[PDB]
Amino acid sequence: LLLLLLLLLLLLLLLLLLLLLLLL
Amino acid sequence: SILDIAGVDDTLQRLLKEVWFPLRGGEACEKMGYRYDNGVLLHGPSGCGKTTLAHAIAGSIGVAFIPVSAPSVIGGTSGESEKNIRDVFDEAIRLAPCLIFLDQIDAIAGGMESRIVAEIMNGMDRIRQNTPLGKNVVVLAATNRPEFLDPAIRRRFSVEIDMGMPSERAREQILRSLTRDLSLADDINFKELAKMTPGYVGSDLQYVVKAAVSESFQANIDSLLAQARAKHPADHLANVSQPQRDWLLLEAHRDEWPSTKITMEQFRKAVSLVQPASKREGFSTIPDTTWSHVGALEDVRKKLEMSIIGPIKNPELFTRVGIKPAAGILLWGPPGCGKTLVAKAVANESKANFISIKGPELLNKYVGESERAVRQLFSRAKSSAPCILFFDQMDALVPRRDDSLSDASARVVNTLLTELDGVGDRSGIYVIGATNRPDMIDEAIRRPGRLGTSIYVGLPSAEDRVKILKTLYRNTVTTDADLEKVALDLRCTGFSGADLGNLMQAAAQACLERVYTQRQQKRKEPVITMEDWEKALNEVKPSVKDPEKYMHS
Amino acid sequence: MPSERAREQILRSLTRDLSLADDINFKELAKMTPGYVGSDLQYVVKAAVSESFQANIDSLLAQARAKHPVSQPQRDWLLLEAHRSWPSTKITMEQFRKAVSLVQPASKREGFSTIPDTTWSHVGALEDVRKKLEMSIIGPIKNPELFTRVGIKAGILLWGPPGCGKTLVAKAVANESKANFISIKGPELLNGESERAVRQLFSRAKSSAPCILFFDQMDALVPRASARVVNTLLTELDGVGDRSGIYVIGATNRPDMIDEAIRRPGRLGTSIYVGLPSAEDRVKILKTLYRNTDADLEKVALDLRCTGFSGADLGNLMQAAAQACLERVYTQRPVITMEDWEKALNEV
Ligand SMILES: Nc1ncnc2c1ncn2[C@@H]1O[C@H](COP(=O)(O)OP(=O)(O)OP(=O)(O)O)[C@@H](O)[C@H]1O
Ligand SMILES: Nc1ncnc2c1ncn2[C@@H]1O[C@H](COP(=O)(O)OP(=O)(O)OP(=O)(O)O)[C@@H](O)[C@H]1O
Ligand SMILES: [Mg+2]
Ligand SMILES: [Mg+2]
Known part of the structure; x- marks a missing residue:
């Protein structure tokens, strides 16, 4: 049998930083 | 043999009642009437002697042994991979009692890939079925990454033996065992060697012995180099460094060693040259600060x-x-x-x-x-x-x-x-x-x-700054009586350790400015003098403006 | 979890084909295993059978040590390698009690525990x-x-x-x-x-x-x-x-x-x-650490300085005293003395 190179997916799921706002 | 593997006394104790017994004394289990479904799993740090131990035990038990290598299972066809596995679990059953060693099991137990695991797990059930229950078949698996095993397979291995890393007592046994066929001196303290090799495994201790052997032959290479030099009068002595010439000298002949023994000084050198596998990645170099x-x-x-x-x-x-x-x-x-x-x-x-x-x-x-x-x-x-x-x-x-x-x-x-x-x-x-x-x-x-x-750790006192300023000035080379006056000066009231270092750097820079003008009134050695400290005290202010903030926490 | 009565059947079912003894009563080892489950009692049987087979191994070594007058585990493999029979014994109820303690219940991995013994x-x-x-x-x-x-x-x-x-x-x-x-x-x-x-x-x-x-x-x-x-x-x-x-x-x-x-x-x-134990309690708290490694304990601790020191904070006092204990050893060149405690009360 021949072994083949296949393209697949990934999960990744990076986490991003955020900026907030405050009251007086 | 068993003599060639040492430091595994705890591991060899469990393997006696979990592998040896249901392979040679199966009659007692037959009289007791108890099936042995124990799947023995060997795991631990890489290089602890899993493969070597499983082959020394196999040769000592005497029952039929079937070595299995995970990469060698694949033959070149999707269906042929199961043929190799189905020819192993059948052979062990046919030649029971037998020992199966699945070395590097995680390489095929992490399409064709998903069917090998199913064939492996089904083959263990057939062992429990197609056996007289008095002639057990034990499957032994070794892997340095037990977490990569398929949970469908690791669940089938009830017995798990964690060899771990050897202790000081165990490492002494390994070192004595390794240096058993070698010629040794009398100063060799194997107990001292075990103390200064923490985190080492059996493979690492093998490198230490191997490193010491090379040091024992260092004297036999310099003599070999000297003979080549005496044969070639001033050859490759220009534009060639000494190590390069040594390779060139020994490359010339390639055609034409006294039996010395290893000393204790070479063993200490060997330990330094050998970096244990546990310290290959993730560890920082020891700081130069004393x-x-x-x-x-x-x-x-x-x-x-x-x-x-x-x-x-x-x-x-x-x-x-x-x-x-x-x-x-x-x-x-x-x-x-x-x-x-x-x-x-x-x-x-x-x-x-x-x-x-x-x-x-x-x-x-x-x-x-x-x-x-x-x-x-x-x-x-x-x-x-x-x-x-x-x-x-x-x-x-x-x-x-x-x-x-x-x-x-x-x-x-x-x-x-x-x-x-x-x-x-x-x-x-x-x-x-x-x-x-x-x-x-x-x-x-x-x-x-x-x-x-x-x-x-807080700001130094006036007497404390004298010790710090003396320490800094000593490690860079005014004498020591002037350093007390500089550090006790009221202008250094809030100086920290860094500020005293900044004060010394300011004085050093003030010296070079004086030196630069000194060499212009003579042409047309720099030493930090007391007058340089006088102008360094004026232009350096403490970095910690409000020390109370950092100690009210 | 299975009830105390229900665990009797599990112990009997697994040991159905095992050579048992008259001293084995499936009520004593059931009441001593509250948190044990079917997957845990399975290993209890395994340990006891292996413990019973340990006699067949130790006796076998005696039968081989006599013939031939390297650590002990390595010697055992060599002795059994020369031979390459086994009396049929029975599980002792005493072994079952020991096998219970050897086998760890799986409820500990989940955090479950039985009725505590602390009063x-x-x-x-x-x-x-x-x-x-x-x-x-x-x-x-x-x-x-x-x-x-x-x-x-x-x-x-x-x-x-x-x-x-x-x-x-x-x-x-x-x-x-x-x-x-x-x-x-x-x-x-x-x-x-x-x-x-x-x-x-x-x-x-x-x-x-x-x-x-x-x-x-x-x-x-x-x-x-x-x-x-x-x-x-x-x-x-x-x-x-x-x-x-x-x-x-x-x-x-x-x-x-x-x-x-x-x-x-x-x-x-x-x-x-909850906190700040009284003087009577702190007598036993200090003696708790000193037990592992009574005159100065009831004096140096019941003073007016070791009042606000909590149980966690009381450990620092002994450690600071222990640090000064080794300081005295080095200056005179492993026993904690009263003079070690006096120079530790005010530094904690
Ligand atoms: N306790 C020991 N006593 C003597 N030699 C040992 C010991 N442990 C390891 N060695 C030696 O170090 C090497 C270990 O190789 P081995 O294949 O046994 O490692 P392993 O535990 O199978 O790990 P991995 O498969 O991850 O490489 C061998 O050369 C073996 O002789
Ligand atoms: N007690 C001291 N003796 C000698 N030099 C000192 C001393 N304290 C500080 N220094 C000098 O100051 C330098 C910087 O101090 P260091 O980095 O150790 O302070 P730190 O407490 O780590 O500060 P930070 O909180 O900013 O990290 C040192 O490398 C040394 O040159
Ligand atoms: Mg290996
Ligand atoms: Mg810092």
Whole structure:
């Protein structure tokens, strides 16, 4: 049998930083 | 043979009643009437002697042995892979009792890939069925990554033997066993060799013996080089370095050794040349800072030499008075006062393994990998115990769990808190934390078991600055009577350790300006003089403007 | 979990074909294994059979050591390699008792524990705390229908300095009322899988009622995940203790680091301050550490300086004294003396 190179997916799921706002 | 594998006394004790017994004394089980479904799994650090032990045991038991290599299972067809496996579990059953060794099982037990695992797991049930129950068949699997095994397979291996790393008593046995066919001197203290090889495995101790053998032949190579030099009068002596000539000289003949023995001095050299596999990645180089680089701070030095440096050197003397060989210390104080300096001196004066974390260095943008770095941080710290973990600027790694924290650093603070809980009292891990803003670090990190020991490093006193200024000036080369006057000057009232270093640098720069003008009135050696200190005191101000802030925390 | 009576069948079923003894009665080893389950009693049988087979191995070594007059385990393999029979024995009930202790119940991995052995004698003081505990947690367990007279129809809170027996108090409470005890740490629960573990703890407690859930460092679990762990916990603190007998005990340092919704009438009741042991208690606390490694202990500790030192803080005093003990050794060139303690009271 021949072994083949296949393209697949990934999960990744990076986490991003955020900026907030405050009251007086 | 069994004689060739040593230091596995605990492991060989379990393998006697879990592998040897249901292969040679199966009649007793037949009389007892008890099926043996125990799947024996060998796991531990790579190089601990799993493959070698499983072959020495196989040759000693005497029953039929079927060595299996995971890469060799694949033959070149999807269906042929199951043919190789179906020809193993059938042969062992047909030739029962028999021993199956699935070396590197995780290589085929992590399409064709998904069917090998099914064939392997079904083959173990046939062992329990197609057997007289008095002639057991034991399948032994070895792997250095037990977590990569398919849970459908690892569940079938009830018996798991963790060889782990050898202890001081065990490493002495390995060293004696390895140096058994060699010629040795009389100064060789195998007990001393075992003390200074922590975190080593059987493979690493084999490199130490191998390194010492090469050193024993160093004298036999220089003599060989000298003969080549005497044969070629001044050959390749120009534009060729000495090591390059040695290769060229020995390349010439290639056609044309006294039997010496290994001394003890060569064994100490061998240990240094061999880096254990546990220290290949993740460990920092030992700092060049000694206690001679640390001026004053005697109170901090005594606490560090009694909680970290002490227990490492004499683990038995300290444990008699209830001083466990593990500590967690949180150095805190105003910046520039020596929190990092003393932590670098402790790492260098304790002769132990050192891991340094530069603030939030463990954070990763992917899910889970940031927390796995923290868990891996303490995994290799245990394997190389004693080890010193230095968290520099720790207020960025464990911030206060306020409302503005996000569900990413909280998951790291919790992981770091649990890992500090898992560090035992006799583990050998000495965690040091340093921060100049203790009001931003989580209060949960200061519980006992965690960094519950706090050492305050603060501004020096007037008499203290004299010790620090003398220390700094001594390590860079005015005499010593003038240094007391400079450090006791009222212009240095708030100077920290860094400010005194800045003061010395300012005086050095003032010297060069004087030297530059000195060499212009003569043309047309720089030494720091007392007049250079006079103008250095005027232009240097303390960096810590409000020291009360850093100690009210 | 299987009941005490139900575990007899499991022990008998596994040992159906095993050569047993008349001394083996399947009632003694059942009452000693409360938290053991079918997967745990399976390993109990395995250990006892292997322990029984240990006699067949040690005797065999004796039969081979005589013929031939390197550590001991390595010698055993060599001796048995030369030979390459076995008397048929029976499992002894004494071995079954030892095999029970060898096999670790799987409930420890999940945090479940049986009825604690700790009583109020182990803890000190709490003469006023005990009066309140016999009506909030200990009270409404022994009397599931007596409190219905006063029309009362889910747990309390504990707070104080750390290391002051707050965990010990919860264990003692579970012993007085004869109920199971489940101590789960805050950070350990936090795993989006930290909410399943909240329901799992209550589901296990309900199936093993009566039981007590002790959330030490609960502030790390529900500080004020923000609306997931704190919301799943609320749904389980409502229907608890009425017809189930479960009462959740929480521990922290101060009664403000946990969510307001947790502290409400119907989920958590009173808040009890635990800490600062009295002089009588601190006598045994200091002797607790010195026991492992009585004149100066009742003098150097019962002074007016070792008053605010908590149990965790008292360990520093011994360590500081121990550090000065080794200081004296080095200056004179492993025994703690009175002069070591005097130079340690004022540095802690
Ligand atoms: N206890 C020991 N005594 C003597 N030699 C040992 C010991 N442990 C290991 N060795 C030697 O070190 C090497 C270990 O190789 P081995 O294949 O046994 O490692 P392993 O445990 O199978 O790990 P891995 O498969 O991950 O490489 C061998 O050369 C073996 O002779
Ligand atoms: N006690 C001391 N003796 C000698 N030199 C000192 C001393 N304290 C500080 N220094 C000098 O100051 C330099 C910087 O101090 P260091 O980095 O150790 O302070 P720190 O407490 O780590 O500050 P930060 O909180 O900013 O990290 C040292 O490398 C050394 O040159
Ligand atoms: Mg191997
Ligand atoms: Mg620093």
